[PDB]
Amino acid sequence: MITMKDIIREGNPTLRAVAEEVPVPITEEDRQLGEDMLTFLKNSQDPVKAEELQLRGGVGLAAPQLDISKRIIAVHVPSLSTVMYNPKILSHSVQDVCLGEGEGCLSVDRDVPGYVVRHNKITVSYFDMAGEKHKVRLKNYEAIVVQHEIDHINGIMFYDHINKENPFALKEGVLVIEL
Ligand SMILES: CCCCC[C@H](CC(=O)NO)C(=O)N[C@H](C(=O)N1CCC[C@H]1CO)C(C)C
Ligand code: NI
Numbered sequence: 393m394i395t396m397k398d399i400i401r402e403g404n405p406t407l408r409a410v411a412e413e414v415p416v417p418i419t420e421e422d423r424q425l426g427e428d429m430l431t432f433l434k435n436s437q438d439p440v441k442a443e444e445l446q447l448r449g450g451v452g453l454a455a456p457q458l459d460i461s462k463r464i465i466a467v468h469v470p471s472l473s474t475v476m477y478n479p480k481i482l483s484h485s486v487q488d489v490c491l492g493e494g495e496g497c498l499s500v501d502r503d504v505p506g507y508v509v510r511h512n513k514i515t516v517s518y519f520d521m522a523g524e525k526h527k528v529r530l531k532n533y534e535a536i537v538v539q540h541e542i543d544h545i546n547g548i549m550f551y552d553h554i555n556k557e558n559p560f561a562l563k564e565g566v567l568v569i570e571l
């Protein structure tokens with residue numbers, strides 16, 4: 393089962409590499425990995441299990457974070473709960489958005505203050521565990537989570553987006569989500 397022991401941290405080069413496309417039809421191993429990833433997210437959100445297993449809560453996870461350089465992401469937003477294989481953003485809004493409390497990441501063991509501005513709306517295509525294609529329109533928090541995970545498969549970390557000089561600057565027009 394995935395626990396914090398399996399999640400690599402900032403400094404590990406795999407987090408900055410570009411993940412490899414996975415085969416379609418989906419391999420049984422990639423299917424299994426996806427299942428284990430979703431199970432981790434659910435476990436991390438269960439107050440009791442999170443304590444038992446000493447897990448940090450998370451709403452998304454990308455294969456590279458497990459030192460598996462593959463384009464596989466799992467999301468469990470408290471809704472949206474699924475595993476996306478070879479996900480790609482086909483289009484996005486002009487309008488941007490950011491979480492008022494900033495972002496964190498299971499691979500980052502330090503607090504990095506500041507706004508992470510992303511697109512408020514995105515259209516994403518992906519293959520599910522059965523290798524069947526889906527095209528979904530996401531927005532707000534769900535869009536933020538998916539962009540955070542897709543960034544991982546492109547070797548990008550949330551803090552790469554922070555304006556170090558002015559971390560809480562808010563360009564006129566950007567939306568804010570407060571959880
Ligand atoms: C919103 C963008 C998606 C964040 C995904 C991460 C999980 C992760 O490491 N993904 O790669 C998470 O849950 N992080 C948490 C997080 O940043 N959260 C949880 C509630 C919303 C937001 C607050 O900043 C903290 C607990 C580390
Ligand atoms: Ni992360």
